[PDB]
Every structure is written in C-alpha cells, then in structure tokens.
Amino acid sequence: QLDPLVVGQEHYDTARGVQSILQRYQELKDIIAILGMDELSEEDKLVVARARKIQRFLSQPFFVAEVFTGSPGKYVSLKDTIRGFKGIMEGEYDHLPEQAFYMVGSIEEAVEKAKKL
Amino acid sequence: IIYDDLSKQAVAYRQISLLLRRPPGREAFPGDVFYLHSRLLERAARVNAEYVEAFTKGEVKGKTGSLTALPIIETQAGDVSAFVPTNVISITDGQIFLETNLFNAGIRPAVNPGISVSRVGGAAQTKIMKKLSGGIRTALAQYRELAAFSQFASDLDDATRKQLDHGQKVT
Amino acid sequence: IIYDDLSKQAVAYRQISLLLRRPPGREAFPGDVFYLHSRLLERAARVNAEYVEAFTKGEVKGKTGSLTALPIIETQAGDVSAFVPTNVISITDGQIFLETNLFNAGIRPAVNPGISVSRVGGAAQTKIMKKLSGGIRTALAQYRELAAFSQFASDLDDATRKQLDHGQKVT
Amino acid sequence: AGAKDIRSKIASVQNTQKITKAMEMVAASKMRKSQDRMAASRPYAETMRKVIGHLAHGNLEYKHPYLEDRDVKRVGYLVVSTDRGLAGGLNINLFKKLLAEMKTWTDKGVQADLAMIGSKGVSFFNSVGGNVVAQVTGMGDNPSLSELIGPVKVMLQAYDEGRLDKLYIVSNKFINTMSQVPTISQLLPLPASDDDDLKHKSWDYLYEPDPKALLDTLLRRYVESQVYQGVVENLASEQAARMVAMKAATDNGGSLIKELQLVYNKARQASITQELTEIVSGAA
Amino acid sequence: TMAEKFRDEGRDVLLFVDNIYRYTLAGTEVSALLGRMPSAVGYQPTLAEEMGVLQERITSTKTGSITSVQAVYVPADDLTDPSPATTFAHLDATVVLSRQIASLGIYPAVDPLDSTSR
C-alpha cells in the first residue's frame, strides 16, 4: 500500500526520505567504525545526526509494554507522525538532543522532553 | 529446578538421533530438537488451586503449586544467533545473558543489560523492589551503547558527566 | 512472454523429483534442472521469413516471427553462486541485476549497470539511442572508477571532481 | 555471508590497518622535525619584542596606532588551518571556537573579517558564508614567511587604514605530544609586556636614522613572526593529531578483524556441514 | 590404563598425551569407516562421548591421582570448532608457549598473559 496513488504524495515522500537517509547512514557506518566521525564531510555529519534522531523517534511506548517499563502508552495518529518526520528531515528540530526523541509520542512531546533533558 | 546444561542434552539427543540414521537439519541437529526442549520446559508452570484440588482428589484444598525452571545454555564465542541458543530463548520466559568481556573486566556477575530481559517483569517483584528499580535495565541499554559510540571524548557535557558517573557507580 | 519466478518452477520440479525418489543433486535439486530451463528458454527465438512461409504453407510471406522472453529470478541476499541462478545466468543472452542497496537509496528502477550485461547491445536499438548511449556508458564507467573517492571528496582535484559530480547527475 | 566473501573483507581490513600503521609512523617523524623547526623560530621574536618594549614602554615612550586601544567597530581574524585531512577533530574544534567568539562579537553589532591560511578553513568558511578577504593555501610541510607576507599585509593595511580594529590570530597551541588546544590570541593592539625595562634606564640606543619610522618597521616585522610562529605551531599540532588519529584507527581495524574472523569461522563450519549432509542424505 | 595401574599402587602419576586432536581425528576416521552419519562439522556423532570416556578416567581418587598434560591443536586457529570446543570443556589449566618470549632468551617460554588456570 506504500504507493502515492494509495497513501497520498506527502506520506509517500516522507517515508521515502526516511528510508533514503537511513540508508545513507548505513553506508557511512563502516567508515565511521574505522576512522571515527571526524573525517565526515560537514553535510554528512548532518545526515548522521538526523538519522540517529529518526532512529530514536521511531521508538514508541506501548500500553502492553506498560509492565516492562513504567512509561504510559501512547497512541499516535498518522497525521502527527508524518508531521513529525517531515519536520525532522528538513531540519527544523536540529537543535534538540537525541535523547529528546527516545520513547515519546508526537513531536510536541519531544520538544517538552528536551526541556527536562 | 536447575538443568545444568541443555546444550549437552541437545548433543546427546543428536548422537542418539544420528545413530538411528535420522536426517539432520541445521547444524546437524535433528528436526525435532525444538520439541525436545519445549515439552520439557513447558512443564515448569504455576497451576491454579482448582487443578490442585482435582489432582489430589480434594485433600489439598485451596493452595497453588508451582515449578520454577532455570536452564543453563553455553554459547560459543558469545553469539546468540545460533540454532539451539535461539531455540531455548524462544521457550523460556526471561533471559539472563552473562557476557565474557564484562566477566574478564571484573564485573561479576556479568549480567549484560539490553540483551537480558524478564518477560514476566515487575509482576514478579515485591512492590518496594518494583518501584525502586523502575526502568534501569533500559537505561543501561543506552548507557552502554552511548559509552561505546562516544569514545573520543565526553563531548556535549549537558549532564553526561552526571549520567555517566551515575551509570558507572550503579554498575 | 514474462515468466514470473522460474525459481518457483524449479522448486515445484524439485518437489516432484524428490517425491519420485530421484537422485538429488546440489541443494537437493535434481540433475536435469538445467535441461528443464534451457529447452524452455531456447524456445524464445526470432525466426526467418522462410520458416514462417513454410510453416503456414503460404498465407504469410516476407514477415519474420519473434518471441521475446523475460524470465525473473530471485536471489537470497544477492548471491549469484546458487544452483538455479547459475543455470539461468548461463542460459540467457543478458542480465538485469536489481540490487537492494540501490533501491533503498532511492535509485528506482534499481538496475545496477556495469554488473549488468546485454550481449545484443546496439543491434537492438534505434540509431539515435545507439549514438547517445555510448557517452552514458563511458560516463558511468568513469564514475564507477572514481566512486571510491566520493566520501573523501573536497580533498580531490577539480578535474576529477567534474567527472565525479557528472556521474552523480547521470545517475 | 559466504566464506570467500568474508575472507576477502578480512584481507581488505588488514590492508587498511597496515596503511594506517604506515601513516602513524610517517606522522610521528614529521612531528619531531616540525617541533624542532618550531624552536628554531623563537630567538627572532624574543629579541625583537625586547626592542619593541624598549621603544614602546621604556623612556620617551613613542606613540603609534598599533600600541593603543582605539574604539572597536569591526574585528579581523587570521585563521590557520591544515591542508590535509585525517587530522582528527583538530580543525573543527578551532572553527567552532572561532564561530562562538565571532558570534559574540556580532551580538554587539560589530562586523568581522577573515584571512585564511590553509585550504580546509577556506573550504569551510565559504560554506558557512564567512567574509574571507585574503587567503594563502598549499603551504604543506614547508611554510614560508615570504608567503605569509601577503594576507598579513592585507590585515595590517586594513588596520592602519582605519577599517579594522583589534585583530586576532586563531591557531592550535602545541602543548604536549598528545595535547593540543585551540587558542585565540591578540596580536594588535600589542599585548602588555609582563617585564619592565626600567633597568634599561642606564642606556639608550643611538637611533640612526630616526626612532619613529624605525618603530613602525619593528612592529610590522613583529606581528609577522608571531603569525609565522602560529603557523608553525599549528603544523606541529597537525602532525601530532594525525599520529593519534591513525593510532586509534589501527586499533579499530584490529578489532574489526576479530569480529570478521568469528563470522568467517561460523560461515565455513556451516558450509562444511551443509555440503556433507547433502552428500550423505543423497545416497538413498 | 598403564597410568591407572600406577594410580592403584597409591602414587601420583603424570600422563602426557602428545596430541589429543589426533585422538579425535582417528575416532572420526574409524566412525567414517563404520559408516555412521557425519555430525556437526563432519566429526563423528559420538565425539563428545568418545572424548569424555577418555577424560573422565583422569581424576584424583582417594587412593591416588592421575594428572594429565595434553598437547592441543586448534584447526584453522578456530577455538569454536567442535574438537577444541569439546576439549576445552575438560581442561583445568592452559599454558601457552610463545616464540616471542623465546627470542627474548627467556626459558621456559610461557606467555604469562594468555596462560590460564581456573
């Protein structure tokens, strides 16, 4: 069902951008392992950081996992998730730390978690 | 009950199966090696009092019995992506993974967080212990990976000087 | 004619041949799997005007018949050294290799040039396309030669920087 | 996987480790040669700063623009950077410190200008959009003063012409063979001498031809040495940082060898058994 | 079985096995000759029992004891191969000899960092 004629152009483009930059991060992992992250071009450091922030924002707390951790479960609507990933990809949240995105609901919870570190 | 090595019961059963000329599968183990451990470990259970009444013909009215199992598995070179280790991980509830690197570094018992889990979870604990120790294993799951990634220096010292001294003293 | 998953005709034939107790070859495939696909694919042919005129006993003249075959094959993690992929790569006139590392990066259709061959070449092209394609082949070949330096770019000379950023635009 | 496919990558990573070891050795020798050339440069600046202190802060203290703190309305920086990568985090720490200070200066609404030594900073600041106005690149292991004459001349002319004020040099201080720190230091207006030449009371030079036109040349030549000194210290710091970085890269390669060999062993065991089981099970 | 007769007399005995890997490999050859199905890496199906039947007789007893020193060979330098993996289950100590220590003119050339005992 991940076709523009089924899910709309905005959803399709967001999903494909996420895939594209996670794949670009996969391609950089092997050189980061050898030489360290300081050899990367200035724009490659940015795709690395945004890829790690996407990887964190993909996490979510569950109502059934509410007994393995203590976090309350979150329900995220499709509109909010594409609204958040489209925001991350184009750099409007570049200033937050990675941990602001770990185990949150919509992006407006990540901006709040950033305040409490 | 403690089975000191299921990874050697599996080898003895493989010997028996190959002497009986049965076709082997992955890693030369028989096809039904999973059914070797499952029908064993599936007997460690907690039973309701109606079952104890129906079994003991009424004599023990209103107590619940249980059998707790702790099988031991030995994995070559620390990998868990292997046939029998993964077969038993797919049967038991929890998973205490003891790591050789931690063990050499003096951290004993070498309980590796992030890989080890308890699928029963906080339901098993006394509520004091449950509340005091809320989510720390997942905290260390990231503390470890970040101390592994951020090797060059303690940069972006927002609270990492507190985080990675708390997570050190906890260990 | 498109054959979708010849690698599933091969599996159905392996099943039939293993239920008949025939001697299993490599990966349990029977010995005659090649002779299964070849006498299929060699039926795709272009046929000259005299064969057509003789077959139809007149009623057609001057015309040449044709039948084009596009068999599809699935590989497990990109390995070409398997049995059925080896046979079919040996039989056909060329290959279009679709790779997942290109598909993920957004290059769609993810055909991998250079690793992909057509032995009919320009003979099956309009002369305008035959004229224009040679510079694309050479551009992508130079790009493949230089691509090792991509993640070290901005260190490079400008004369090779031009080739490197031209190959990216062709891609 | 595939046993041959994994052995090929084991060989590739071993070759990489060997290359990085050779680079560590080369850098560890160039570091010594560079840090000796660094010591060969002290006497000029020292024995010239004593003279400048005598003519400037001694008796009959003369008056010169470069000696006094006119009000600041725009600032200038001389930026030294490496011409070669693989130096670790050396250049980016320095450029980030420069951007922090240059942003603090533009909070007050002052304008700022840059002059670049080395190719890396030239590449960086055009991407950030900095106002570079003069540059020299391609110094390599052989930094001449007769090439630094140019941009230092541009900055000095822009200073005495009234445009710039309070110009700086930013560079890496070589402190230990494994410790180099980015520093921003003030060259003009001239920093204040710790020592006092009141003890020079008892003598005065026979200035031929005349003291003011001579102090001008002394001050111009002095900023040049201090810049040149900054360039040579930055070069020795680059060599030390590349040494450390290639050391780390060789150890990372040495661990990837362990992981790849474990994978190769598992692959070859699985291949032996998967072949021999097919053979034995095929024989009815 | 000669070491065991020395044990019964009340003595402490040393038994040297010049290469136990060749004991495993000859068991594999005999197993193949008898026509039994090949085990994890082609080794015999009875590998872990043929090894234990030997190594279980080398024990201290309340009349005497047999200690054993066994030269070990690791195929393809693989400490995961079934033969090393089965042998290491029984060893109590492990002494590594290194040529670097001998080039230093130090004898015995025991590597003290990798040498191990439980």
Short mmCIF file of C-alpha atoms in Angstrom, two decimals, chain D residues 159-271:
data_model
loop_
_atom_site.label_atom_id
_atom_site.label_comp_id
_atom_site.label_asym_id
_atom_site.label_seq_id
_atom_site.Cartn_x
_atom_site.Cartn_y
_atom_site.Cartn_z
CA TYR D 159 44.09 48.17 10.35
CA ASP D 160 46.19 51.30 9.87
CA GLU D 161 43.86 52.47 7.09
CA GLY D 162 41.28 52.78 9.88
CA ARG D 163 38.87 50.00 8.91
CA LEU D 164 39.74 47.09 11.21
CA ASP D 165 40.33 47.19 14.95
CA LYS D 166 41.59 44.65 17.46
CA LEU D 167 42.63 41.88 15.05
CA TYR D 168 43.29 38.33 16.26
CA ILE D 169 45.14 35.17 15.31
CA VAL D 170 43.45 31.81 15.93
CA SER D 171 45.59 28.67 15.99
CA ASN D 172 46.30 25.43 17.84
CA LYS D 173 48.84 25.61 20.66
CA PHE D 174 51.16 22.61 20.70
CA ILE D 175 51.49 21.77 24.40
CA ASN D 176 52.14 18.02 24.66
CA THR D 177 52.84 15.30 22.13
CA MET D 178 49.22 14.24 22.65
CA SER D 179 47.65 17.53 23.81
CA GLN D 180 46.89 20.48 21.53
CA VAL D 181 44.38 23.20 22.40
CA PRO D 182 42.75 25.78 20.10
CA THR D 183 43.61 29.31 21.20
CA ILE D 184 42.52 32.78 20.11
CA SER D 185 45.20 35.33 20.94
CA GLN D 186 45.55 39.08 20.43
CA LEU D 187 48.41 40.37 18.29
CA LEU D 188 47.44 44.07 17.77
CA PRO D 189 46.85 46.23 19.80
CA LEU D 190 50.14 44.97 21.20
CA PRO D 191 49.65 42.87 24.31
CA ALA D 192 51.20 44.19 27.53
CA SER D 193 54.74 43.02 28.44
CA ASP D 194 54.98 41.23 31.82
CA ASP D 195 58.57 42.58 32.25
CA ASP D 196 59.68 46.21 32.92
CA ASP D 197 62.73 47.78 31.11
CA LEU D 198 63.20 50.39 33.82
CA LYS D 199 66.56 48.66 34.26
CA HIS D 200 67.40 49.73 30.71
CA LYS D 201 67.44 53.29 32.14
CA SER D 202 71.17 53.44 32.10
CA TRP D 203 71.48 53.24 28.34
CA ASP D 204 69.80 54.47 25.18
CA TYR D 205 70.28 53.37 21.57
CA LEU D 206 71.94 55.72 19.03
CA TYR D 207 68.89 55.56 16.74
CA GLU D 208 70.02 56.00 13.12
CA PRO D 209 68.20 57.33 11.14
CA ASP D 210 65.23 58.24 13.40
CA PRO D 211 63.13 56.35 16.04
CA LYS D 212 59.53 56.63 14.78
CA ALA D 213 59.99 55.41 11.20
CA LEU D 214 62.06 52.62 12.78
CA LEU D 215 59.46 51.59 15.38
CA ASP D 216 56.93 51.31 12.55
CA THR D 217 59.05 48.71 10.74
CA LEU D 218 59.84 46.92 14.01
CA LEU D 219 56.14 46.49 14.80
CA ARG D 220 55.23 45.30 11.31
CA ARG D 221 58.01 42.71 11.35
CA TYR D 222 56.99 41.57 14.83
CA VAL D 223 53.38 40.73 14.01
CA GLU D 224 54.76 38.75 11.06
CA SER D 225 56.97 36.50 13.20
CA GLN D 226 54.19 35.84 15.70
CA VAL D 227 51.88 34.83 12.84
CA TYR D 228 54.59 32.72 11.28
CA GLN D 229 55.08 31.24 14.75
CA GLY D 230 51.38 30.47 14.93
CA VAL D 231 51.53 28.73 11.56
CA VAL D 232 54.44 26.51 12.57
CA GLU D 233 52.89 25.57 15.91
CA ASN D 234 49.65 24.68 14.12
CA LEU D 235 51.61 22.46 11.74
CA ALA D 236 53.29 20.54 14.56
CA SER D 237 49.89 20.18 16.23
CA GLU D 238 48.52 18.76 12.98
CA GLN D 239 51.26 16.15 12.84
CA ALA D 240 50.64 15.10 16.45
CA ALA D 241 46.89 14.87 15.91
CA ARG D 242 47.26 12.75 12.78
CA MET D 243 49.58 10.44 14.71
CA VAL D 244 46.99 9.94 17.45
CA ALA D 245 44.12 9.52 14.97
CA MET D 246 45.86 6.86 12.90
CA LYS D 247 46.78 5.04 16.12
CA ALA D 248 43.09 4.88 17.04
CA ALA D 249 42.16 3.80 13.51
CA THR D 250 44.69 0.96 13.63
CA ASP D 251 43.16 -0.35 16.85
CA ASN D 252 39.63 -0.11 15.42
CA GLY D 253 40.78 -2.13 12.42
CA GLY D 254 42.37 -4.65 14.76
CA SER D 255 39.01 -5.21 16.45
CA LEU D 256 37.06 -5.47 13.21
CA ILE D 257 39.47 -8.28 12.31
CA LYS D 258 38.32 -10.21 15.38
CA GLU D 259 34.65 -9.80 14.56
CA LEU D 260 35.03 -10.68 10.88
CA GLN D 261 37.07 -13.77 11.73
CA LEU D 262 34.38 -15.03 14.10
CA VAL D 263 31.83 -14.59 11.32
CA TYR D 264 34.11 -16.37 8.83
CA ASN D 265 34.56 -19.33 11.16
CA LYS D 266 30.81 -19.73 11.59
CA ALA D 267 30.33 -19.47 7.82
CA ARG D 268 32.91 -22.13 6.97
CA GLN D 269 31.58 -24.55 9.58
CA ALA D 270 28.07 -24.15 8.19
CA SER D 271 29.37 -24.70 4.65
#
